[PDB]
Structure formats: structure tokens, C-alpha cells
From Swiss-Prot:
The gene is petF. Belongs to the 2Fe2S plant-type ferredoxin family. This is Ferredoxin-1. Its cofactor is [2Fe-2S] cluster. It comes from the Bacteria. Disulfide bonds join 18-85. The lineage of its organism: Bacteria, Bacillati, Cyanobacteriota, Cyanophyceae, Synechococcales. Binds 1 [2Fe-2S] cluster. One of its GO terms (biological process) is electron transport chain. It comes from Synechocystis sp. (strain ATCC 27184 / PCC 6803 / Kazusa). One of its GO terms (molecular function) is metal ion binding. Keywords: 2Fe-2S, Disulfide bond, Electron transport, Iron, Iron-sulfur, Metal-binding, Transport. Ferredoxins are iron-sulfur proteins that transfer electrons in a wide variety of metabolic reactions.
């Protein structure tokens, strides 16, 4: 289970279900492009999850995550409960 739903990085559709916390670019962006999560908001743009619509950060607080509990749009590389992960175009390095 876990790590299986859908994501999309330089390696388009990736599988992620994070039914055990995590999801972070590590699940996808690292499954094929290795990129740990730490820089924190205001430090990078690699974690631009486009509609994570899955991993529920929960501990958003001041740190960026999902806006409140469902929005990969922000740096969601530090979520908490993860009811399925859905990050598309987490960061195409262009922002079409």
C-alpha cells in the first residue's frame, strides 16, 4: 500500500498513496529525481505541488504545506496525515 496513487515530475505520472505520512517531493520528485525536503518555504521552488489534493499536511502553521490541509500548490514537502497523494506538475521547472 502507500506510494501508488498519482503524481507528475520530470517523470510525469508517478505512483504515490502516502497512507502513512510522507508524500513529499521525496515520494515522487525523489523516486526518480532525488530531492530531499528541507529548504523550507522561501528557500526553493522545486516543491510547487500542483494540487497535491492528497497528502494532508495538517502541520501547515507558518511553514508552507497545503494552505490548510489540501493544497499541494504550496511547499507540501512537509505534510503529516496523507490520505492518498496527488501532485501533478509538482514543478515542471517552467510554470506554463
Amino acid at each position: 500500500a502507500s506510494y501508488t496513487v498519482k503524481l507528475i515530475t520530470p517523470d510525469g505520472e508517478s505512483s504515490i498513496e502516502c497512507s502513512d505520512d510522507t508524500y513529499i517531493l521525496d515520494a515522487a520528485e525523489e523516486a526518480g529525481l532525488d530531492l530531499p525536503y528541507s529548504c523550507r518555504a522561501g528557500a526553493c521552488s522545486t516543491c510547487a505541488g500542483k494540487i497535491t489534493a492528497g497528502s494532508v499536511d495538517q502541520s501547515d502553521q507558518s511553514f508552507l504545506d497545503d494552505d490548510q490541509i489540501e493544497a499541494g500548490y504550496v511547499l507540501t514537502c512537509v505534510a503529516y496525515p496523507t490520505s492518498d497523494c496527488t501532485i501533478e506538475t509538482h514543478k515542471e521547472e517552467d510554470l506554463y
